[PDB]
Amino acid sequence: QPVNDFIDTATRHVLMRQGVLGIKVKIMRDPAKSRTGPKALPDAVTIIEPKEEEPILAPSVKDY
Amino acid sequence: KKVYTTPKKIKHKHKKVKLAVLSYYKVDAEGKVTKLRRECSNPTCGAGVFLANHKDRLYCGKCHSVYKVNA
RNA sequence: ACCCACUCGGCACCUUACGAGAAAUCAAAGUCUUUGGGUUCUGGGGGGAGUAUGGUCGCAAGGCUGAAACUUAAAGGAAUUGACGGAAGGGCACCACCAGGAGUGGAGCCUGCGGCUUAAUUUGACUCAACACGGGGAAACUCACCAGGUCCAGACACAAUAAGGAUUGACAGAUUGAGAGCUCUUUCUUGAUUUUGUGGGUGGUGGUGCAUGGCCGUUCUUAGUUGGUGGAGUGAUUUGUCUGCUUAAUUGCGAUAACGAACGAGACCUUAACCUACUAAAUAGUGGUGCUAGCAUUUGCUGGUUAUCCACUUCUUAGAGGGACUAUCGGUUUCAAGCCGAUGGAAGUUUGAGGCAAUAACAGGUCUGUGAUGCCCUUAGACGUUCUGGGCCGCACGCGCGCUACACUGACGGAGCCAGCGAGUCUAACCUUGGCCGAGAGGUCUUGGUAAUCUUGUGAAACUCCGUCGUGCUGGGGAUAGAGCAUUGUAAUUAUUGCUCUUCAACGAGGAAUUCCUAGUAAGCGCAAGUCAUCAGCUUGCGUUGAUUACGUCCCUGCCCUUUGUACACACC
Ligand SMILES: [Mg+2]
Ligand SMILES: [Mg+2]
Ligand SMILES: [Mg+2]
Ligand SMILES: [Mg+2]
Ligand SMILES: [Mg+2]
Ligand SMILES: [Mg+2]
Ligand SMILES: [Mg+2]
Ligand SMILES: [Mg+2]
Ligand SMILES: [Mg+2]
Ligand SMILES: [Mg+2]
Ligand SMILES: [Mg+2]
Ligand SMILES: [Mg+2]
Ligand SMILES: [Mg+2]
Ligand SMILES: [Mg+2]
Ligand SMILES: [Mg+2]
Ligand SMILES: [Mg+2]
Ligand SMILES: [Mg+2]
Ligand SMILES: [Mg+2]
Ligand SMILES: [Mg+2]
Ligand SMILES: [Mg+2]
Ligand SMILES: [Mg+2]
Ligand SMILES: [Mg+2]
Ligand SMILES: [Mg+2]
Ligand SMILES: [Mg+2]
Ligand SMILES: [Mg+2]
Ligand SMILES: [Mg+2]
Ligand SMILES: [Zn+2]
């Protein structure tokens, strides 16, 4: 499906003196810009980066 | 392929004759002009057009074919 | 005789490489451009050729010595990647077997192919990967073929003819299959649109698919491709990408001069399964209520009523979510990836079935899909086109896909009586309910539907029940043929199709061989759609009834992978 989604293909027939040539063009668009559709490949698996903690600290409690 | 055959005799064409024509008309000694060959009473053939004289047969050629007036 | 240590001198092997080399490799092939221990011998591109000639030795065969002319741009070495093998080792698979199912191969017919025949029987394609294929079911059309008849739709440029008329058309007759003015007779008509010529176009189901594009099929039911940093090598390259294990998978685990990634696989997408949770619905449906029929009557049971109202969303529809991750437990295993069993679960075989699908190869098929196309051919007595008629169907016979059958798990006759995927008419005649008529086929009058609204609950068929028949080519089987009725169409003859009576063939389970298939599958059974005016024995799908037997292997066959050989690289054609 991402093919449907992200690649755009066109074949044109250039008619030259000696015969004709077939031109095929493929363009793959950046998924991260998709504006209106999946923002990535189905493949894509990002893990959010954890936060270096400064734990310890014996109990205590705030009052408001 | 094969090429050529024929029991001879190739069909021709048409010519549409010649004729230095429209002498048919008679003008007297200065100079009354009388029409030879009657003209056609069809409202699509304003009386300039004439009728050919065959046998029985008078014929409007301007009517590309049509109508068979006969005297 | 044996064991240990040492030491001369041998035949060898192992590991390394400071070092050498074009490399393969080498304790010499090292101590060489930082070039000298002593010495002998041989080579100077490839052929011509160890040939000619002379000498010499030999019994001979022949040995030693040993040229040139001429010809030629490479011959050659080592290694690398491919490609191929009628070498070796592993694997993978119902287009392979195993266990079986259902058959085809035998028969009648249908249908494609060859062959023959023919005026013509248009043509492409011939192992899987040609032969119910070209969506190829051809009565005209299609159509390309054959017998014949018209027309130019021959752009444009120059030239010529020529307004005293360049050219156009025709009635009747002749003619012709033809009510074609094709041609001719005849004599009007037309008015610069044409005609003639050359040049140039143009069309062409003409050729070339071995000139091409595009598309498609095949290898492939396969698992392969590539770069970053590091390691190896002067280099092309290699390692990564690997013994093993595991997987449908270069899928992973693991091993590890590699580490970490990308394409392909997976992911993704579509469809089938699960939601009494969500949002709803007179184009879907339930319960209640009225109005109402029948049977009982004791409240009951079974129906009618596109709105008589009320409520709901379980069944139907389709939006949004949710769900499964081989989960829990256990066995097995390098307790690794995984595989196996049990439980739970709508669902645990990639959940089932599909879509999409890398790099690369083929002189695979298609110029007969294209106003895609190069080149060649042809172009007015056309290979353009159209009209009439025939032909693709022609039948000693070979081959392939099929359909129907050989009956009693059946045929026939009454009766029960249940799907799913679909499709339908505007400037038109498509899908057709209902009523009459008709034995049937059909006919006729109306009708609903541009559709979840009507056809249609598509009341489909196998199937189920009660009967008749009773093993007899029988009432199994329905070829062939006669006679009649209708439908489509301008047209049905060589019989489009449908109905009816009659005729009642082979076929008594099919030799050698051979196809397909593992679960809602095989097989049986029908339906809708494509085609379609009319014609399905074909296909694409659909649901209905619903098994037996594997859940393995490398024996056959096909392929893939390593190893290995190569003088191949246009790559064993
Ligand atoms: Mg090699
Ligand atoms: Mg078997
Ligand atoms: Mg058998
Ligand atoms: Mg014709
Ligand atoms: Mg010309
Ligand atoms: Mg010419
Ligand atoms: Mg053409
Ligand atoms: Mg080709
Ligand atoms: Mg091609
Ligand atoms: Mg050919
Ligand atoms: Mg399979
Ligand atoms: Mg290096
Ligand atoms: Mg490899
Ligand atoms: Mg619901
Ligand atoms: Mg269970
Ligand atoms: Mg070829
Ligand atoms: Mg083509
Ligand atoms: Mg045919
Ligand atoms: Mg076939
Ligand atoms: Mg019956
Ligand atoms: Mg009658
Ligand atoms: Mg109406
Ligand atoms: Mg009988
Ligand atoms: Mg019968
Ligand atoms: Mg049909
Ligand atoms: Mg067909
Ligand atoms: Zn007139």
Tab-separated table of N, CA and C in Angstrom, chain A residues 10-45:
chain	number	residue	atom	x	y	z
A	10	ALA	N	5.179	7.545	-14.129
A	10	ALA	CA	4.676	7.933	-15.445
A	10	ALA	C	5.543	7.401	-16.558
A	11	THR	N	4.906	6.703	-17.503
A	11	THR	CA	5.550	6.285	-18.748
A	11	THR	C	5.103	7.128	-19.940
A	12	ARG	N	6.075	7.644	-20.690
A	12	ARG	CA	5.818	8.362	-21.941
A	12	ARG	C	6.628	7.791	-23.092
A	13	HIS	N	6.053	7.899	-24.288
A	13	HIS	CA	6.570	7.302	-25.518
A	13	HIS	C	7.213	8.336	-26.425
A	14	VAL	N	8.539	8.423	-26.419
A	14	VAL	CA	9.190	9.430	-27.240
A	14	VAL	C	9.481	8.862	-28.620
A	15	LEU	N	8.833	9.469	-29.606
A	15	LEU	CA	8.858	9.005	-30.979
A	15	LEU	C	10.033	9.622	-31.744
A	16	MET	N	11.102	8.853	-31.906
A	16	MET	CA	12.278	9.355	-32.599
A	16	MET	C	12.480	8.774	-34.000
A	17	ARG	N	13.390	9.389	-34.743
A	17	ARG	CA	13.655	9.051	-36.134
A	17	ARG	C	13.837	7.545	-36.370
A	18	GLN	N	14.592	6.877	-35.492
A	18	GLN	CA	15.039	5.501	-35.762
A	18	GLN	C	14.022	4.486	-35.165
A	19	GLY	N	13.213	4.892	-34.193
A	19	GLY	CA	12.200	4.026	-33.585
A	19	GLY	C	11.536	4.791	-32.438
A	20	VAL	N	10.940	4.124	-31.447
A	20	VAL	CA	10.537	4.914	-30.270
A	20	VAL	C	11.170	4.397	-28.985
A	21	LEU	N	11.379	5.315	-28.043
A	21	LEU	CA	11.817	4.952	-26.705
A	21	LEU	C	10.716	5.136	-25.668
A	22	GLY	N	10.655	4.175	-24.754
A	22	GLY	CA	9.796	4.276	-23.599
A	22	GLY	C	10.555	4.887	-22.437
A	23	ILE	N	10.030	5.991	-21.900
A	23	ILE	CA	10.557	6.615	-20.699
A	23	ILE	C	9.669	6.272	-19.502
A	24	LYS	N	10.220	5.674	-18.449
A	24	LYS	CA	9.458	5.592	-17.201
A	24	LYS	C	10.116	6.426	-16.085
A	25	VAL	N	9.328	7.271	-15.424
A	25	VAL	CA	9.812	8.030	-14.268
A	25	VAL	C	9.132	7.626	-12.959
A	26	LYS	N	9.936	7.449	-11.920
A	26	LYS	CA	9.442	7.142	-10.587
A	26	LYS	C	9.831	8.270	-9.650
A	27	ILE	N	8.886	8.766	-8.867
A	27	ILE	CA	9.264	9.663	-7.803
A	27	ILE	C	8.706	9.164	-6.494
A	28	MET	N	9.572	9.130	-5.499
A	28	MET	CA	9.182	8.797	-4.150
A	28	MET	C	9.183	10.082	-3.315
A	29	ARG	N	8.013	10.436	-2.758
A	29	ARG	CA	7.836	11.652	-1.939
A	29	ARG	C	8.173	11.415	-0.479
A	30	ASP	N	8.604	12.464	0.202
A	30	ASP	CA	8.957	12.305	1.593
A	30	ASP	C	7.664	12.099	2.387
A	31	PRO	N	7.569	10.965	3.091
A	31	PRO	CA	6.366	10.618	3.856
A	31	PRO	C	6.137	11.552	5.038
A	32	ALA	N	7.235	12.047	5.603
A	32	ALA	CA	7.202	12.892	6.776
A	32	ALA	C	6.485	14.210	6.510
A	33	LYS	N	6.206	14.496	5.239
A	33	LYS	CA	5.518	15.728	4.854
A	33	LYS	C	4.087	15.483	4.407
A	34	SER	N	3.622	14.249	4.585
A	34	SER	CA	2.452	13.733	3.860
A	34	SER	C	1.192	14.609	3.936
A	35	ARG	N	1.184	15.591	4.838
A	35	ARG	CA	0.106	16.575	4.926
A	35	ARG	C	-1.276	15.935	5.158
A	36	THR	N	-1.659	14.984	4.313
A	36	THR	CA	-2.968	14.346	4.415
A	36	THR	C	-2.899	12.843	4.137
A	37	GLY	N	-2.382	12.087	5.101
A	37	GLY	CA	-2.198	10.654	4.946
A	37	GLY	C	-1.116	10.208	5.905
A	38	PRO	N	-0.758	8.920	5.882
A	38	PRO	CA	0.232	8.377	6.816
A	38	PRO	C	1.504	9.207	6.797
A	39	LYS	N	2.040	9.530	7.962
A	39	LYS	CA	3.171	10.436	8.018
A	39	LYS	C	4.495	9.685	7.910
A	40	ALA	N	4.412	8.364	7.737
A	40	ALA	CA	5.598	7.505	7.709
A	40	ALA	C	5.358	6.195	6.952
A	41	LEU	N	6.395	5.368	6.850
A	41	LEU	CA	6.221	4.014	6.348
A	41	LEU	C	5.632	3.151	7.452
A	42	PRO	N	4.814	2.170	7.067
A	42	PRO	CA	4.292	1.158	7.983
A	42	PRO	C	5.406	0.533	8.817
A	43	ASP	N	6.561	0.352	8.169
A	43	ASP	CA	7.840	-0.017	8.781
A	43	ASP	C	8.171	0.718	10.064
A	44	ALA	N	7.863	2.014	10.096
A	44	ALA	CA	8.567	2.931	10.997
A	44	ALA	C	8.201	2.770	12.488
A	45	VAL	N	9.216	2.534	13.311
A	45	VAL	CA	8.993	2.300	14.726
A	45	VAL	C	9.932	3.160	15.554
